[PDB]
RNA sequence: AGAAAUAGCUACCACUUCUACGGAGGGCAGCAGGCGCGCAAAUUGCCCAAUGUCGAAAAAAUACGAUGAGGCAGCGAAAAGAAAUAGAGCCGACCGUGUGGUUGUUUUCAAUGGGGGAUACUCAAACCCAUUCAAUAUCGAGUAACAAUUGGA
RNA sequence: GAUCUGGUUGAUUCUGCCAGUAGUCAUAUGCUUGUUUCAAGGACUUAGCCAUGC
């Protein structure tokens, strides 16, 4: 029948110009809708919004479903450019997008050699 | 009547604790002497070997033969009686076993037409004599 | 020699949840006590919304992004008390903190003229090596030269960015007090009397703006000025009135009605 | 292990197990309403107890007690909105009162049957667990919600359901893909 | 600065490990695990994301502080809160009572979750919830073998 | 919820204790167990003895 469409609003908002950042809470409105809404969907809404050069300012987490219904909330920041983005995004939150640092290894090893380096000198 | 003072509170304090020790269910909880003399040393259960099976009679005005066996404990190696219930389950204790002993009810007090019986079996070999009296577990 | 403090164990005006976490950050010595304060990590966290993690107000308090009295502080346990200006130049923005109506920390947004201004409380005058008054203050500052006047009760208008003294109120039944402990906290009124028992607490009893009667101790009050009109500083809200209970629960309920 | 959450009881057994006034009693309630368990009547006996107790001790304090306006108020406003006593009745002595049924009678199992969406008491308790009514446009499905005076012209169908404007159900499906 | 500190030192007493027989060590009532004791009690797991402490430290790079404190998941009817195991009718056979509930025999007709799968959400990474069986476009009870027990008369 | 019942006599009215009855974030054992939320978990006896890693 009916085609499903997706409607983001925001209802709190802030400007940090200690953190370079505005921040929001997200709200989707999705009746319709079969199963979920990726995060790259209101990124692509919220640019929209809010006319950004790269769609990579924004970040969304935390969104939780509401019980037996077509909505979504969940937390929305925005960077005013790319390289204040890179600086201040936790670690993580850039690997969900395929672009923060690559690994470290096992815990247990590195606390295995240093325990094993308090035997010996030089 | 007694005494009525606004200022005998020190008399009417030591008349209730002097009065208190004439019950028996009040002294049997603050004198240590029915542990020492309880073969469960204030337990819901014990463990213990069995020894041998005998058959006491009922008394007087009943007739039978109550199936108990002799048990000694392993926490303190202290020998008691108990009975074994329901029908048959004599062949499901075998000697030398070892089994799980509980209270009769009544608190130390002996249940029944069986003289001076107050355990009964509740565990052989760690499996359940009831389970095995259902048929819904077999002897190890 | 305790580092730590145990959430259940923190101040109640916190107001932090007990089920977000163990442990509260303990605020170091230094110009307030440990209970009559709140840490500037609170602030940025909590009461303004600035950070969101723990990691963040390192981000903005190691950079000296935050001031306190004219000083930028990178400590985030760093205790901040009453009466104490909280700018943040970045933003704009800055706070004084006092007590609200209710017993609580409150931060009102003053002007830039009286961001500048202070008021301290004397607790003690003595002499130094030499001939040198200098009296202690509630904050902690010691004050070189003061005016000989001063006692101690009475309280000293400061300037802060530049340090030196604007004036000096005595105390005396006349001036206007705010209650500063005692469940009373958070209240202003003037001073009927004041009663003496010497080797122990004296008693002052005031009288506050809608005619009610309340008592406290007299190391409680921290006398403001000689007349409600003539505050250096500003004021919260409610101006410290207090009203019945019932009343509050009445006017909360039809004023959610006419609002929705 | 460090946990600081809270939980409680509901319910609690009644004494004298076996009396056959309270067993015939209570068994009417239970086929009449389609209860499943005798613990939702005993959970009901509880929080009406509590009510009857709080009345209790503020009908012994005097009038005009700050206590008592404030307290008093409070209980009659919650008994009024969620539907236990009648506009009219306001003296706070019309709470000791109350019976069982009264509470009862504002279950959303009950209301459903009563506004006529259902032919029957068990079929509106089917209808609410398998995610049917929606009371303010929320999806409601769980029995014992207790309906407020201000939401009965709201109780309605959901949209996602079958027999309001949703796709066709289980059966229609399996239908059609037979 | 602060200890008469046990993952600081010294000795004696009880048990105890390696050795080339000259000697040298050990302290789980910290975390997980084993023996014994008993009626009686869980994995030799992942992580610094949150909460904090310490520090010569904010984050970012030609450049990632530690932390079994702490948190997360495995086992777990101690206990506590919600809650399925069916709803409407059809046609005979009826049961009582005076024509209105009812008790099986045939038989349709919808609804829904145990079950399984993602455009995916969560998550520090995985799991559980919460959404959804087309949005052109997505599996499924009928002797509902998807079968309620434990005690009694 | 401010509640009681069976046993002394050929019957009756008592004192009085035995037995019944409801709980317990109170422990253990037996039988039986589809879903979900929140959760205590080697104190009890032996502050007994401890391989290995942190
Ligand atoms: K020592
Ligand atoms: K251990
Ligand atoms: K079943
Ligand atoms: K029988
Ligand atoms: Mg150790
Ligand atoms: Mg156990
Ligand atoms: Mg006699
Ligand atoms: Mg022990
Ligand atoms: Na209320
Ligand atoms: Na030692
Ligand atoms: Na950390
Ligand atoms: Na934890």
Same mark, same amino acid.
């Given at each position: ?23 929001? #809470? ?11 809404? @990726? ?37 929305? +920041? ?17 690997? *969900? ?26 | ?8 509170? =020190?008399?009417?304090?030591? +008349? ?32 213990? %070997? ?22 000694? +404990? ?9 009975? &074994? ?15 799980? #002993? ?6 130390? !007090? ?31 | ?23 509260? @950050? ?35 308090? *190691?950079?000296?992004?935050? $001031? /306190? ?14 009466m ?14 006092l ?7 409150? +931060? ?9 201004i202070?008021m301290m409380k004397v ?10 008054? /200098?009296?202690?203050?509630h904050?902690? !500052?010691?004050?070189?030269?003061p005016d000989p006047r001063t006692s101690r009760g009475d309280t000293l208008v400061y300037? #802060?960015?530049?340090?030196?003294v604007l004036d000096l109120i005595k105390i005396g039944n006349g001036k206007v007090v705010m209650v500063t402990?005692?469940?009373n906290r958070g209240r202003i009124g003037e001073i009927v009397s004041i009663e003496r028992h010497?080797?122990?607490?004296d008693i002052a009893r005031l009288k506050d703006a809608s005619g009610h009667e309340f008592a406290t101790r007299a190391t409680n009050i921290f006398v403001i000025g000689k007349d409600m009109s003539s505050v250096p500083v500003t004021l919260?809200?409610?101006q410290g009135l207090?009203?019945? &209970? ?15 | 292990? =460090? ?26 309630? $239970? ?20 009510? *009857? ?21 409070? %209980?009659? *406003?919650? $008994? ?30 009950? #209301? ?10 068990? !079929? ?10 929606? &009371? ?12 407020? /005076? ?17 796709? @066709?159900?289980? /059966? ?7």
């Open positions: 029948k009916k085609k499903a469409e997706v409607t983001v609003r925001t209802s709190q908002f802030k400007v940090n110009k200690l953190l370079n950042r505005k921040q929001f #809470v997200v709200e989707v409105n999705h009746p319709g809708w079969c199963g979920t809404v @990726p995060a790259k969907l209101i990124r692509n809404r919220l640019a929209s919004l809010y006319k950004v050069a790269d769609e990579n300012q924004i970040s969304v987490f935390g969104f939780k479903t509401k019980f037996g219904g077509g909505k979504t909330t969940g937390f929305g +920041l925005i960077y005013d450019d790319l390289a204040a983005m890179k600086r201040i995004e936790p670690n993580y939150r850039k690997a *969900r997008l395929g672009m923060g640092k690559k690994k470290l290894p096992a815990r247990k090893s590195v606390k295995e050699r240093r325990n094993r380096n308090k035997k010996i000198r030089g | 009547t007694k005494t009525n003072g606004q200022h005998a509170a =020190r008399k009417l304090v030591r +008349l209730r604790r002097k009065n208190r020790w004439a019950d028996k269910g009040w002294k049997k909880s603050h004198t240590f002497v029915a542990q020492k003399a309880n073969p469960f040393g204030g337990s819901s259960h014990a463990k213990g %070997i069995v020894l041998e099976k005998i058959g006491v009679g009922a008394k007087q005005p009943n007739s039978a033969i109550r199936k108990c066996v002799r048990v000694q +404990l392993i926490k303190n190696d202290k020998k008691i009686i108990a009975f &074994v219930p329901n029908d048959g389950c004599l062949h499901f204790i075998e000697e030398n076993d070892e089994v799980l #002993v509980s209270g009769f009810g009544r608190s130390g !007090h002996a249940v029944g037409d069986i003289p001076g019986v107050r355990f009964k079996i509740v565990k052989v070999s760690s499996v359940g004599l009831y389970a095995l009296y259902r048929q819904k577990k077999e002897k190890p | 020699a305790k580092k730590h403090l145990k959430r259940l164990y923190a101040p109640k005006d916190w107001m932090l949840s007990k089920l977000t976490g163990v442990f509260a @950050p303990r605020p170091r010595a230094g110009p307030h006590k440990l209970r009559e304060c709140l840490s500037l990590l609170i602030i940025i966290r909590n009461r303004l919304k600035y950070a969101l993690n723990a990691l963040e107000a390192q981000m903005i308090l *190691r950079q000296g992004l935050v $001031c /306190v009295d004219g000083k930028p502080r990178k400590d985030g346990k760093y205790p901040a008390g009453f104490d200006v909280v700018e943040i130049p970045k933003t704009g923005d800055r706070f004084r903190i007590y609200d109506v209710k017993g609580r920390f409150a +931060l009102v947004r003053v002007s830039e003229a009286e961001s500048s202070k607790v003690n005058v003595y002499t130094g090596t030499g001939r040198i008054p /200098v009296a202690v203050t904050d902690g !500052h010691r004050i070189r030269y300037d #802060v960015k530049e340090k030196k402990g005692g469940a010497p080797g122990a607490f919260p809200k409610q207090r009203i019945n &209970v019932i009343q509050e629960r009445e006017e909360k309920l039809i004023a959610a009605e006419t609002r929705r | 292990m =460090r946990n600081y959450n809270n939980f409680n009881r509901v319910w609690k057994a009644p004494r004298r197990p076996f009396e056959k006034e309270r067993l015939d009693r209570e068994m009417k309630l $239970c086929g009449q309403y389609g209860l499943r368990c005798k613990r939702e009547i005993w959970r009901v006996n509880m929080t009406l107890s509590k009510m *009857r107790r709080t009345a209790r001790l503020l009908l012994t304090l005097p009038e005009n007690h700050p206590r008592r306006l404030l307290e008093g108020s409070a %209980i009659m *406003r919650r $008994c009024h909105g969620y539907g236990f006593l009648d506009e009219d009745k306001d003296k706070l002595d019309y709470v000791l009162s109350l019976t069982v049924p009264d509470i009862l009678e504002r279950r959303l199992q009950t #209301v459903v049957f009563k506004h006529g969406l259902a032919k029957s008491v068990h !079929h509106s308790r089917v209808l609410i667990q398998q995610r049917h009514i929606a &009371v303010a446009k929320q999806i409601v499905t769980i029995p014992s919600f207790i309906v407020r /005076v201000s939401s009965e012209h709201h109780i309605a169908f959901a949209d996602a359901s079958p027999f309001g404007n949703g796709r @066709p159900g289980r /059966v229609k499906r399996v239908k059609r893909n037979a």
